[PDB]
Design a protein around this nucleic acid. Structure first.
Length: 50
DNA sequence: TGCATCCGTGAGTCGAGGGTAATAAAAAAACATCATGGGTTGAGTGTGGTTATTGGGGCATAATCGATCTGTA
């Protein structure tokens, strides 16, 4: 599976999940912790906003 | 101070079907409202019409060859 840009959820405007509905991968909170441990603030900013 | 009592907590990506149902009353009048159909505005898109032409061919008016019988050592 892979997704560049597709459907977005309705209430919260976030990408859906699952290969069946062509959903994006879930960037959980553990990986957010890992990124802020690295110090890569810009990668986090794009991962949370754009 | 000891007792019961209440109040948060407790993972992670993932897939596939994905929706089901105990019951109930009719009249009448009254009103609201959309639905269609026919008629004015009006808003177009449609179609011919006069008048600006600029290359082209044309006839004038000139011009430079091509062919033979009279004058000079």
């Amino acid at each position: 599976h892979a997704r560049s840009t597709g459907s977005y959820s309705l209430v919260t405007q976030q990408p859906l999940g699952g290969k069946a509905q062509f959903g994006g991968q879930r960037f959980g909170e553990m990986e957010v912790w890992a990124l802020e441990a690295y110090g890569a603030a810009y990668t986090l900013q794009e991962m949370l906003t754009v």
